[PDB]
Assembly symmetry: D3
Homo-oligomer: 281 residues x 6
Amino acid sequence: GSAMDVRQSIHSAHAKTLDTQGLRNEFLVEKVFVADEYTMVYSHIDRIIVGGIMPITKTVSVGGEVGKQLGVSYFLERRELGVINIGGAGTITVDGQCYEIGHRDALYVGKGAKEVVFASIDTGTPAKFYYNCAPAHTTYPTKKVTPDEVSPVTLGDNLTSNRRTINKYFVPDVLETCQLSMGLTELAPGNLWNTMPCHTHERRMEVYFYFNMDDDACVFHMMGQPQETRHIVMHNEQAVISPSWSIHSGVGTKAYTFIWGMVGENQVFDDMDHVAVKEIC
Amino acid sequence: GSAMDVRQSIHSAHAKTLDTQGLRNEFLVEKVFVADEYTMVYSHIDRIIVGGIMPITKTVSVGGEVGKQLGVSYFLERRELGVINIGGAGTITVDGQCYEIGHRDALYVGKGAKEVVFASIDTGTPAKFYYNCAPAHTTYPTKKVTPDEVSPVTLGDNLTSNRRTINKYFVPDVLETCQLSMGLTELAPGNLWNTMPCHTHERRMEVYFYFNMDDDACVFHMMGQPQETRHIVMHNEQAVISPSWSIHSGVGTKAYTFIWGMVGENQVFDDMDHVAVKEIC
Amino acid sequence: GSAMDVRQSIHSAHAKTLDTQGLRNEFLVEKVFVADEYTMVYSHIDRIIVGGIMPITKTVSVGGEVGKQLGVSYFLERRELGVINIGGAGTITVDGQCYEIGHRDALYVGKGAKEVVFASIDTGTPAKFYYNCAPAHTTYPTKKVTPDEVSPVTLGDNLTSNRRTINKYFVPDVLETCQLSMGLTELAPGNLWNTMPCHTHERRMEVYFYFNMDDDACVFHMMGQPQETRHIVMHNEQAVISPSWSIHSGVGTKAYTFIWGMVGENQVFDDMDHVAVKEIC
Amino acid sequence: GSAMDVRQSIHSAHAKTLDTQGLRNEFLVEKVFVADEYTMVYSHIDRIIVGGIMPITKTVSVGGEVGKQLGVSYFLERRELGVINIGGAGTITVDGQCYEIGHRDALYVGKGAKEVVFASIDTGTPAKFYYNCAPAHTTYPTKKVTPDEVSPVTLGDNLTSNRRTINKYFVPDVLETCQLSMGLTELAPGNLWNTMPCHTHERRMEVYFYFNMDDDACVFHMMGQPQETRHIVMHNEQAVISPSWSIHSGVGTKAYTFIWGMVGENQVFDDMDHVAVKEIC
Amino acid sequence: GSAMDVRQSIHSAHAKTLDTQGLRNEFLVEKVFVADEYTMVYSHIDRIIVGGIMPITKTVSVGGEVGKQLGVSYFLERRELGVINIGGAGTITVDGQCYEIGHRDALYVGKGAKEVVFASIDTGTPAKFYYNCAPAHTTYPTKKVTPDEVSPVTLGDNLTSNRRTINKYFVPDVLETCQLSMGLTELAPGNLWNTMPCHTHERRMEVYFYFNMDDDACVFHMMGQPQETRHIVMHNEQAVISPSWSIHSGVGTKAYTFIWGMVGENQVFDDMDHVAVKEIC
Amino acid sequence: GSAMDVRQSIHSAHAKTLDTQGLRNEFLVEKVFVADEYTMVYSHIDRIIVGGIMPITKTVSVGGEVGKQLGVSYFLERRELGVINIGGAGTITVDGQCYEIGHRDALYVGKGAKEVVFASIDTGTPAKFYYNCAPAHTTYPTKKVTPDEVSPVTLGDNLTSNRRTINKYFVPDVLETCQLSMGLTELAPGNLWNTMPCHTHERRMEVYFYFNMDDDACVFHMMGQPQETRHIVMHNEQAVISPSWSIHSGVGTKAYTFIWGMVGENQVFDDMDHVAVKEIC
Ligand SMILES: [Zn+2]
Ligand SMILES: [Zn+2]
Ligand SMILES: [Zn+2]
Ligand SMILES: [Zn+2]
Ligand SMILES: [Zn+2]
Ligand SMILES: [Zn+2]
């Protein structure tokens, strides 16, 4: 069926020997949005599935076929889905129930949903549905989350180039999920740093997706163990997978927006090892 | 805090470069049963936790402290436990509820159980509780499983040295679990091969535990991708971790018994890639 | 002239870094029997030459041409030859003297024989002459050895899966040779292990040839230093070269038969380092 | 003799295999200013010598002894020196001629000067003389360069986090030198990027020195071939050597100031390969 | 424009891992003389440029175009040139001034010369102009040097196979140059060794060019650190680049002649580390 | 038991990765003559044993104990010995039979000799017995070989620095041996090259022993495949082992003498691959 980009899990000792292209081949997802298609990358790190869906002349659906590829009857038979629309207004129909998902609206689809259909309202400005999918043992209600219900928080300062607005869509304070959490953080114009100071967490893993970047800009995404850092240079609408032993911080050449997705054996966000940047240098 | 042996996940390209000791350091658990203590190995491959508990002069408990090591309040706050006793009669008390677990009896403890205490009835023939623990999002009832509740099946033939009795303890036909399944297979005297022909399954992983072996015997456990196989020579009461891209088949120098534990994103046991041994050679 | 597959000698430190294919390229002889042809593999480990001859529509001979390839006048000008027929009845003619070599009959040809011609009696069930050839400084009588003159010995036990019958064809008790010894060992149905416990011998080297195996079976041939073992998966009618620092033991998925050939600076079979399997694990 | 830290030249194929510590060992100068001493690093890349001098309780001189270490009679017998004071007011006496070098004043010492003595006016706020020294075949006049003699130019913008003031001290428009050029660039508060977009120049090499940074800040200095970039995390008052095949661009966690030094076979600053950041990603 | 063979600088730790071809690719210049063309090899080790010019049917000139390749207006705008003719009589015209350069005559061209034109008097026995070019900050007079003005010295002894005649063309005793020195040494018939005992010099580098060798002869050129020597097998009219950490000595299979060129930060020829051959063995 | 220096056989792909010390560890025998002792090196390349014996205050014998180390009853039970005395007059007693072996006299001891005792006539000028020992299947008569029994041949020329006198002691024209041949070649003063042009022979191997060299001299012994040559720098009285795939040619810094020993499956000295030195370069 549809092509499935599979990434293996990786040992820190192996990762530290990878050259530039080697790092990209393992951790970088270069193509997230493809017209009238959905992309799908399967990571053996917590078995999270990441991708993008951009419906233009036709709808794009996931269900039976994808499920068979996963050894089950349908895609979400034993999985939960988190979707955030960074493009134009669209709709997501779950087993017949249509949800209007506008710019920056989001939708969490619980375990048990048989078919999910994505569509764009205007072909001129198509919806760009970014998603993260994780194994789920229990069914929680499918829920639409708007920027309102999120209650954004602006932190940082120009001097530390981290003035930004944090929007947490899928977290305990908003709704119940099995293990998936997602949020969107927008750096203010002229501000470049995200996740600083950095951190690592043995019991959870994160995937970052960068977007809303000018064609001539990029983000130097920092990864690796604190004392053995490496970087991947990324451009607009690309995602990066972070092993549990790795940090995940980035600095752009211009301001940008990014989405973070996190899974693991717990949802204790303070269960992490904070790393002061001075320790790195 | 109690020592926690942590094993990282590993890429097939990395594993194929490991020498004999390297393979042992990564995949082999050399000591499972330690008097009056519990052993615990954490594998980043599906975050399964495995070990053994052998109470002799005192009971051994797991609960609050172990939970703190996992960033939670107690061991099973977000996990399920599967235990099989291969030693003498003992008991397992879950939050005050005492279960009599004799030789070859087993106990599944669901998510939410706060403290589990293991004990042996006779210090001369201590219980040997082998356990596998996996993340769980749903709470299923704690349940004792005995041999007469399991439907034993004899398969194989002497000519193929695989005459054996299969005993599936934690499987869909017996009880509901989130992702864990476990069983015990005993080879008839003079029969050496397990999991032959072999297989691999991208969506699940298994851990094998070998026991009931003479002091002068061993098992050559075959692992690796089908076309890049390797082996680890193991002795009595040792376990081996198998990545999803790896096979897991062993041949002893004498008959033996082993327990398999499996976790992953589905419990579709037929969702695998069968590998005819003739393909390997 | 005829193609000659040459294998170099190898250092233990080099061998331990070889991957699956690397091990096969160095030590495995994949094609031993080819219709109306003879195969010839030259190993710089004691300069032993191994191969197979399967005459069907024509006879196959070795003599002048092969000798020139070795820098001499004829193949056995400074070499001795040991041949064992594992196929249908045939004949081996040495400088005009015809020897009837039936199934499991053997022939030792001493230094000085100028031409050796191999033939099959029935094209439907051709002779399969397996041979080992070694440098020889003195001429010993050409001698036909039948399964009678061998006096077989049955050892082992089903429990250790090594019940087998040992047939030593070319050994001091049967005839005089310069340095070559050969024998045939047949495992009883349902028995899998050969050369266990294993051993190594600095002053001699062995070559194993596996046959009489079902098309769906294989043998996991164990090699390498005792504490750094590796394996080569082999199928019907394939041979494997063992360096002096390496062990040579194998376990099949079904019973099989194999021939061993040994050369070196002495024929003291007890001059070896025995290795208890428990030492390996 | 005074300790001389010697760095070899390096091939791009070699540099791309270096791990974090390896990169630091080769290209990073971790200690530049040491009380009452001078530091000295010799790079086989164009044989440039770099270091710092911080006189506190006594003067620090360079002359005869250093010359002997270079196989000549005195330090500047065949070399030219460029010094920039980033500390408190001080003086530099060249063969008896005393020059008052205040904060941000600089001094170029031409070939032929026998002894140079560095001093600080106030021990409470010692002068911090950063210097770059290169081979010189011609004698140009020793010359003091002050800020009002330099033509400061403000470039960049907050949106691209590169708002900065460029101060070129030793350049063709100011004075004549054999091959050395040096300048000081100060990023405005909240601006982090230097040398963006980046470049490479086969015929020249540069050394960057970062300072005026808070104790809790650092600079991720980007290096390497454009398609094989690496980074070195540096802290206050540390320098980095850049091979001709490498880029040199840094981004801080906070604003900072840095000095660049450049040598080579020409002083054609436009003789370089411009690299658009979009090419890297 | 004209092809430019660029060689990077190299670290001793990198060089010691290079195989035979790797050493040749880095240090050997296989083609020095090409009919009606000039060859040009640029080494990042002191930025010396080496090559050969053999005019036959047309003159060969260097000037504007080559200069542009170096980022300047003309080849010698910031460089000095040393040329030695090992072929038939020719002429070298510098900015209109014609110099007659016969067999073994030489010409030093100082910084500032805009165009240099090479020509041969007889096409049957063309001039073979070998040159070395180095960065130069000051202009010294262009000067023709004949074998007379050189005052040759014959040293060595047949017993040590180093009987030879040394001819130093460009050295302080003959003329002033910025950093370049060159000479020609001819081994007597039957004498094979050059530069023995060997040496190294951190502050200078040398390039050796071997010629006047029979078609069936070669020179085993020894290089590398004294305790980690390697060799490059060379034939008639080939040059070899030597890093500052490397020795440069050679032994032929027959007598030969060679030219040495040296550049660096000083012209103190006794500033070196002598190495007794007994130290090497 | 007496120390036995054992060298493994080696693959060309392995040998080409060895650094200077690695090559020495594998192929070089640094100490051959030790006062009142015998040295012994065992090479798995044809199982040749080499060493030296220098009796000063007492005799040195080889027999029973050494045999036990080889798994036999006595040293020469299945081996032949070739000895050449390069020191002062001495004697060699074989099972009671005393042979007077003066300077440059030699002795071949055939298979079956039980004990060999070496002695020196004058302690002031001790005998220096260099020996090569190889497996032997046939018993040939023990025989003393003197210079006047050898047919010396002078070859080479000063122009090719290979003027030398060849003395073949153990060869077909002198006596019968199983596989061993040995000779002594002395270069005339001022001549440095041996075995030039070089060669390789798949069916035989050689060991070279250099001596009569001044304390300030050495020999650059060339080895390796023709297109992947390496060298080992040796001093007085040191030996070097050459794999069948390797060349063996040396060039001294002064004249010297050397002994070659050769074994293999044939004694056809013309059965080799001639390599023109021009092929190497
Ligand atoms: Zn994180
Ligand atoms: Zn499995
Ligand atoms: Zn054996
Ligand atoms: Zn630059
Ligand atoms: Zn030199
Ligand atoms: Zn040879």
